[PDB]
Design a protein around this ligand. Structure first.
Ligand code: NAG
Ligand code: NAG
Lengths: 105, 99
């Protein structure tokens, strides 16, 4: 139903037929980024739960797939599996933990 | 000296018109579809094409079918070997059997 991701449809009457209105979703403006499959921290591998790892060149952010909003890499939106020696292309960065500043204060 | 049926059916007015789309531009369409479905995932079928590395696209497809993407990245070479063997097997299947 239409070109792009679909949202709704509205029918309309017509002589000897039917006329549809497929409201659809189309992304418009694009931006280059540098990605990596996983993040290495303390010998273990972190993966995005529902998102993707991107970087502007200096910092690393996790972002949802079809819209650009940057978020800090935390343990809440990542899950751990395996070591850093089996994935290919993994980069080195820290992983934030929200429990550490709560335990500090 | 040995008349075939093409000339016999041509001399009684039964002509065959040529198609508009010849095999060169059909092959060009298939090449464009393959290039899009390798280097863009499924985004080009909705809006414009976006570059995505192939391993991450396979991770997205596995996350679609119900297996989380850590299974892929620890078993990528097995996936590549099985895919190459499957393509070779289907090439041999088209080479041998004519049915
Ligand atoms: C990304 O980089 C490529 C490589 O030069 C360039 O052609 C392209 O215009 C850039 N931007 C986008 C949105 O792809
Ligand atoms: C990440 O750090 C480890 C040591 O902590 C190092 O051996 C490895 O080469 C680093 N990764 C990259 C891509 O340089």
């Amino acid at each position: 139903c239409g070109k792009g991701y679909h949202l709704m449809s509205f029918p309309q009457s017509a002589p000897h037929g039917v006329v549809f209105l497929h409201v659809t979703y189309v992304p418009a403006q694009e931006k280059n980024f540098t990605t990596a499959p996983a993040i290495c921290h303390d010998g273990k591998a972190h993966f995005p739960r529902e998102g993707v790892f991107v970087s502007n060149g200096t910092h690393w952010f996790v972002t949802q797939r079809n819209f650009y909003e940057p978020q800090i890499i935390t343990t809440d939106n990542t899950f751990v599996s395996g070591n850093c020696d089996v994935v290919i292309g993994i980069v080195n960065n820290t992983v934030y933990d929200p429990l550490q500043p709560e335990l500090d204060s | 000296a040995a008349r075939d049926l093409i000339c016999a059916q041509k001399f009684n007015g039964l002509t065959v018109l040529p198609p508009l789309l010849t095999d060169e531009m059909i092959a060009q369409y298939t090449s464009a579809l393959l290039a899009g479905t390798i280097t863009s995932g499924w985004t080009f079928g909705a809006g414009a094409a976006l570059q995505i590395p192939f391993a991450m696209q396979m991770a997205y497809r596995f996350n679609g079918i119900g297996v989380t993407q850590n299974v892929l990245y620890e078993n990528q070479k097995l996936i590549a070997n099985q895919f190459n063997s499957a393509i070779g097997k289907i090439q041999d299947s088209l080479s041998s059997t004519a049915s």
